[PDB]
């Protein structure tokens, strides 16, 4: 995240890491043993850690428990990264709490203007690389879809949306991808590409969740 500001410890209670002996991509608790996160994350060897701060301390309130399957969309596209959403099923189901919940699925798109929190372990620099041990946190509207497609002409589809800044300085970065999107409590999008991070006129782009829920429900109901 860049320009973002420090969460607080376990203030974002749904965001979960995906590890493979270090942190590559967020993701969101959907239930306790559900997780979404971004398809271009996939790999095999997934740990997902549950109640984390420091991802490099263990400070207490983490739950280490392993992928059983990941399912990326069938009509997932690597090279446009349309439909860039995955679902992760636990092994066991995690233990809920204050520190570690679920965030609610929405039941309408929510419209330009909404204001929404965006957080992760990714990049904090725009140029360069600074990993946090802790997670940051950014507040970011929903753009129009005009400014939008003004901003990547052609690479934008109707299950993408926009937030963030056109003036450049705060935005989410790589090793945020896969993680949560959360207007008015609801999980709106996940992190999903952007052109380098922070830069004037280039917002992120976000898979738009809105689109996918019955998908959602259909896949973990025969899961
Ligand atoms: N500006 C954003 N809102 C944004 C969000 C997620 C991103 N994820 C990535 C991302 C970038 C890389 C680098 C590779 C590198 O420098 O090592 C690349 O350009 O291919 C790789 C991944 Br995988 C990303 O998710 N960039 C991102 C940018
Ligand atoms: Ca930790
Ligand atoms: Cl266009």
Redesign the pocket.
């Known amino acids: 995240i860049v320009g973002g500001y420090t969460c607080g410890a376990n203030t974002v209670p749904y965001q979960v890491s995906l590890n493979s002996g270090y942190h590559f991509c967020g993701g969101s608790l959907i239930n306790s043993q559900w997780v979404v996160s971004a398809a271009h994350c996939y790999k095999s060897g997934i740990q997902v850690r549950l109640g984390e701060d420091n991802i490099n301390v263990v400070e207490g309130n983490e739950q280490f428990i392993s992928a059983s399957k990941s399912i990326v969309h069938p009509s997932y596209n690597s090279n446009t990264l349309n439909n860039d959403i995955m679902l992760i099923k636990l092994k066991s189901a995690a233990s809920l709490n204050s520190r570690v919940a679920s965030i609610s699925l929405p039941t309408s798109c929510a419209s330009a203007g909404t204001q929404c929190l965006i957080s992760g372990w990714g990049n904090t620099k725009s140029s360069g690389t600074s990993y946090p041990d802790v997670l940051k946190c950014l507040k970011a509207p929903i753009l129009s879809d005009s400014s939008c497609?003004?901003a990547?002409?052609?690479?934008?589809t109707s299950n993408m949306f926009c937030a963030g800044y056109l003036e450049g300085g705060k935005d989410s970065c790589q090793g945020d991808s896969g993680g949560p999107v959360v207007c008015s409590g609801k999980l709106q999008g996940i992190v999903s590409w952007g052109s380098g991070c922070a830069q004037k006129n280039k917002p992120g782009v976000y898979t738009k969740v809105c689109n996918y829920v019955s998908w959602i429900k259909q896949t973990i109901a025969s899961n």
């Not at 990547?152 to 934008?156: A, E, K, L, R, T």
């Open positions: 497609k003004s990547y002409p052609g690479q934008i």
